[PDB]
Amino acid sequence: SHRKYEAPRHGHLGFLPRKRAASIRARVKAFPKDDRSKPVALTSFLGYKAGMTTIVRDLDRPGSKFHKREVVEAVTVVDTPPVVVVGVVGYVETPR
Amino acid sequence: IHVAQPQARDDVKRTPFIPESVKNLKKYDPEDPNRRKLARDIEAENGGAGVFNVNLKDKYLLEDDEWKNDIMPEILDGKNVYDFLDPEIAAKLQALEEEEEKLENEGFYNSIYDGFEASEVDDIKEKAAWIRN
Amino acid sequence: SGNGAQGTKFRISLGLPVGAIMNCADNSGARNLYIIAVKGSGSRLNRLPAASLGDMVMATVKKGKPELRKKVMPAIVVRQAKSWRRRDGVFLYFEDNAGVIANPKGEMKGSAITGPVGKECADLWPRVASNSGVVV
Amino acid sequence: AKSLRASSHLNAKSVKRRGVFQKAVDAREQRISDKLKEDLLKQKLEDLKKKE
Amino acid sequence: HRGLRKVACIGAWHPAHVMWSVARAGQRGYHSRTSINHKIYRVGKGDDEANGATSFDRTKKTITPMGGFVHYGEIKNDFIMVKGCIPGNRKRIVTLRKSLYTNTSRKALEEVSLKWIDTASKFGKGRFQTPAEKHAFMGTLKKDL
Amino acid sequence: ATRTQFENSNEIGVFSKLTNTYCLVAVGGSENFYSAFEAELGDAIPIVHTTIAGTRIIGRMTAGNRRGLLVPTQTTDQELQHLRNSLPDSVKIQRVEERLSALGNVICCNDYVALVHPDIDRETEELISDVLGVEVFRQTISGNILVGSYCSLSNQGGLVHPQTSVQDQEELSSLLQVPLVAGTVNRGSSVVGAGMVVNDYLAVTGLDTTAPELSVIESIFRLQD
Amino acid sequence: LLCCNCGTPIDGSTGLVMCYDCIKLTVDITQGICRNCERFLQPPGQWIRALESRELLAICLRRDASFIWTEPHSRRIRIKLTVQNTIIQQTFEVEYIVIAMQCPDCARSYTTNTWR
Amino acid sequence: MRIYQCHFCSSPCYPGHGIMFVRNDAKEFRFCRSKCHKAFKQRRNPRKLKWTKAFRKAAGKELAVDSTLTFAQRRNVPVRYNRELVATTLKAMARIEEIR
Amino acid sequence: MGRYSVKRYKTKRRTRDLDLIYNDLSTKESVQKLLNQPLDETKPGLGQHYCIHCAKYMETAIALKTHLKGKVHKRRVKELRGVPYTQEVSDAAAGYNLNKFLNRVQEITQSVGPEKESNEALLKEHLDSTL
RNA sequence: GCAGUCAAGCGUUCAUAGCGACAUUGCUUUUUGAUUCUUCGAUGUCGGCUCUUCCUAUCAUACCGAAGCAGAAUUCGGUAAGCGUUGGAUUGUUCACCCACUAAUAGGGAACGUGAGCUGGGUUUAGACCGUCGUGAGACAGGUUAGUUUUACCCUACUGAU
State the smallest CA–CA distance between residue B40 and chain A in angstroms: 15
Query: Which of B43, A79, A63, D36 lies closest to E110, judged by CA?
Result: A63
C109, exposed or middle or buried, with CB in 10 Å at 0-12, 13-18, 19+?
A: middle
E4 touches strand J (CB under 7 A): no
- What are the C-alpha distances in Å from E124 to residues B62, E65, E67, E69, F159? 46, 12, 11, 11, 60
Which amino acid makes up residue B49? A
F211: three-class secondary structure by DSSP: helix
Residues C58, C74: Cα–Cα separation, whole Å: 4
| CA-based torsion, F225, G6, G7, G10: positive or negative | negative
Q: What are residue H12's DSSP bridge partners?
A: H5
F114 phi, psi to nearest 5 deg: -135, 140
> Cα angle vertex F160, ends F157, F165, to 5°?
120
Query: Which of C107, E82, F87, C112 lies closest to A52, judged by CA?
Result: E82
What residues contact F164, with CB distance under 8 A and at least 6 apart? F141, F142, F172, F180, F182, G12
Q: Which of residues 21-80 of E touch strand J (CB under 7 A)?
A: 21-27
Residues I1, I6: Cα–Cα separation, whole Å: 7
Residues I100, I89: Cα–Cα separation, whole Å: 10
Cβ atoms of H89 and H96 within 8 Å: the answer is: no
Residues F219, F212: Cα–Cα separation, whole Å: 11
Residues D28, D35: Cα–Cα separation, whole Å: 12
- What are the C-alpha distances in Å from I72 to residues C30, I8, I53, I67, I84? 35, 16, 10, 8, 19
Residues C78, C102: Cα–Cα separation, whole Å: 12
> Cα angle vertex H95, ends H91, H96, to 5°?
125
Query: Which of I27, I42, I16, I4 lies closest to I111, judged by CA?
Result: I27
Cβ atoms of I95 and H69 within 8 Å: the answer is: yes
Tell me how many domains chain F contains: 1
Query: Which of G54, G51, G50 lies closest to G34, judged by CA?
Result: G50
Q: Which bases of strand J sit closer than 7 A to a protein CB?
A: 1, 8-10, 19-22, 32-33, 48-54, 61-63, 82-88, 96-105, 107-114, 116-119, 150, 157-162
State the smallest CA–CA distance between residue E131 and chain A in angstroms: 18
CA atoms within 13 A on the CB side of H30: 20
Axis crossing angle, helix D20-50 with helix D7-18, rounded to the nearest 10: 50
Give kind and range of the element (H or E) at residue I116: helix I113-129
What residues contact F14, with CB distance under 8 A and at least 6 apart? C126, C129, C130, F57, F59, F60, F194
- Measured between beta carbons, the chain A residues lying within 8 angstroms of H1 are 56, 70
What residues contact G92, with CB distance under 8 A and at least 6 apart? G30, G80, G81, G83
Q: CB of A61 within 8 Å of any CB in chain F? A: no
A7: three-class secondary structure by DSSP: coil
G27 phi, psi to nearest 5 deg: -85, 150
State the smallest CA–CA distance between residue F208 and chain G in angstroms: 11
Residues E87, A49: Cα–Cα separation, whole Å: 9
- What are the C-alpha distances in Å from C38 to residues C34, C74, G31? 11, 9, 22
Q: Cis peptide before E15, with omega less than 30 degrees from 0?
A: yes
F155 phi, psi to nearest 5 deg: -70, -30
In whole angstroms, J161 C1' to I82 CA is 71
Axis crossing angle, helix I113-129 with helix I28-35, rounded to the nearest 10: 30
Q: Which ranges of I25-68 would DSSP assign to H, the alpha helix?
A: 28-35, 62-68
F189 lies in which domain range?
1-225
**Buried-exposed string I98-117: b where 16+ CB fall within 10 A, e elsewhere:** beebeebeeebeeebeeebe
Q: Which ranges of F90-191 would DSSP assign to H, the alpha helix?
A: 122-131, 166-176
I94 phi, psi to nearest 5 deg: -90, -15
N-term to C-term CA, chain G? 78
8-state DSSP, B66: T
Cβ atoms of C30 and C63 within 8 Å: the answer is: yes
Three-class secondary structure assignment of H39-83 = HHHCCCCCCCCCCCHHHHCCCCCCCCCCHHHHHCCCCCCCCCCCH
Three-class secondary structure assignment of C49-99 = CCECCCCEEEEEECCECCCCCCCCEEEEEEECCCCEECCCCCEEECCCCEE
Domains along chain C? 15-136 (2.40.150.20)
Residues E82, A78: Cα–Cα separation, whole Å: 8
I112 phi, psi to nearest 5 deg: -80, -25
**Buried-exposed string G60-91: b where 16+ CB fall within 10 A, e elsewhere:** eeeeeeebeeeeeeeeebebebeeeeeeeeee
Residues C7, F6: Cα–Cα separation, whole Å: 11
> Cα angle vertex I95, ends I90, I99, to 5°?
85
Cβ atoms of F31 and F48 within 8 Å: the answer is: no
Give kind and range of the element (H or E) at residue B126: helix B118-132
Cβ atoms of A46 and E94 within 8 Å: the answer is: yes
Cβ atoms of F186 and F217 within 8 Å: the answer is: no
Q: What are residue E82's DSSP bridge partners?
A: A76, E40
8-state DSSP, I112: I
8-state DSSP, F108: E
Torsion of CA B1, B7, B13, B16, to 10 degrees: 10
What residues contact A49, with CB distance under 8 A and at least 6 apart? A76, A78, A79, E86, E88, E89, E90, E91, E92, E93, E94
Residues C95, G43: Cα–Cα separation, whole Å: 49
CATH number at residue F104: 3.75.10.10
Residues C32, C64: Cα–Cα separation, whole Å: 7
CA atoms within 13 A on the CB side of I93: 30
Residues H5, E143: Cα–Cα separation, whole Å: 27
The number of residues making up chain A comes to 96
Residue F2 CA, distance from chain mean position: 16
- What are the C-alpha distances in Å from I59 to residues C121, I65, I67, I123? 40, 11, 11, 19
**Buried-exposed string F86-113: b where 16+ CB fall within 10 A, e elsewhere:** bbeeebbbbbbebebbbbbbbbbbbbbb
Cβ atoms of H8 and H46 within 8 Å: the answer is: yes
Residues E38, A78: Cα–Cα separation, whole Å: 13
Residues H64, H57: Cα–Cα separation, whole Å: 6
Query: Which of E104, A62, D24 lies closest to B51, judged by CA?
Result: A62
Q: CB of H16 within 8 Å of any CB in chain A? A: yes
Strand ranges in I19-128 using DSSP code E only, listed in sequence order: 50-51, 56-57
Cβ atoms of F183 and F171 within 8 Å: the answer is: no
Residues F159, D23: Cα–Cα separation, whole Å: 57
Residues G96, G58: Cα–Cα separation, whole Å: 12
| CA-based torsion, B48, B49, B51, B56: positive or negative | positive
> Cα angle vertex C119, ends C44, C10, to 5°?
35
Query: Which of E141, G109, I11, A1 lies closest to H23, judged by CA?
Result: I11
N-term to C-term CA, chain F? 13
What residues contact B51, with CB distance under 8 A and at least 6 apart? A62, A63, E106
Residues F47, F86: Cα–Cα separation, whole Å: 8
Residues E80, A83: Cα–Cα separation, whole Å: 14
Residues C72, E18: Cα–Cα separation, whole Å: 50
Residues I44, F58: Cα–Cα separation, whole Å: 43
The 10 Å Cβ neighbour count of residue C51 is 28
Three-class secondary structure assignment of I1-24 = CCCHHHHHCCCCCCCCCHHHHHHH
H57 lies in which domain range?
2-65
Query: Which of G36, G44, G46 lies closest to G107, judged by CA?
Result: G36
A10: three-class secondary structure by DSSP: coil
C108 phi, psi to nearest 5 deg: -75, 160
Nucleotide nearest to G35 (CA to C1'): J21
Cβ atoms of F158 and F220 within 8 Å: the answer is: yes
- What are the C-alpha distances in Å from F58 to residues C36, C117, F183? 34, 16, 24
What residues contact B49, with CB distance under 8 A and at least 6 apart? B43, F29, F30, F31, F32
**Buried-exposed string B4-36: b where 16+ CB fall within 10 A, e elsewhere:** beeeeeeeeeeebbebeebeeeeeeeeeeeeee
**Buried-exposed string E26-50: b where 16+ CB fall within 10 A, e elsewhere:** eeeeeebeeeeeeeebbebebeeee
8-state DSSP, F38: H
Three-class secondary structure assignment of chain G = CECCCCCCECCCCCCCCCCCCCCCCCCCCCCCCCCCCCECCCCCCCCCECCCHHHHHHHHHHCCEEECCCCCCCCEEEEEEECCCCCCCCEEEEEEECCCCCCCCCCHHHHCCCCC
Q: What are residue A91's DSSP bridge partners?
A: none
D17: three-class secondary structure by DSSP: helix
Q: Which of residues 2-41 of A touch strand J (CB under 7 A)?
A: 2-10, 13, 16-20
What residues contact I4, with CB distance under 8 A and at least 6 apart? none
Residues B40, B44: Cα–Cα separation, whole Å: 6
C46: three-class secondary structure by DSSP: coil
F186, exposed or middle or buried, with CB in 10 Å at 0-12, 13-18, 19+?
A: buried
Q: CB of H26 within 8 Å of any CB in chain F? A: yes
What residues contact G111, with CB distance under 8 A and at least 6 apart? none
Tell which D residues from 16 to 45 touch E, by Cβ distance under 8 Å: 16-17, 20-22, 24-25
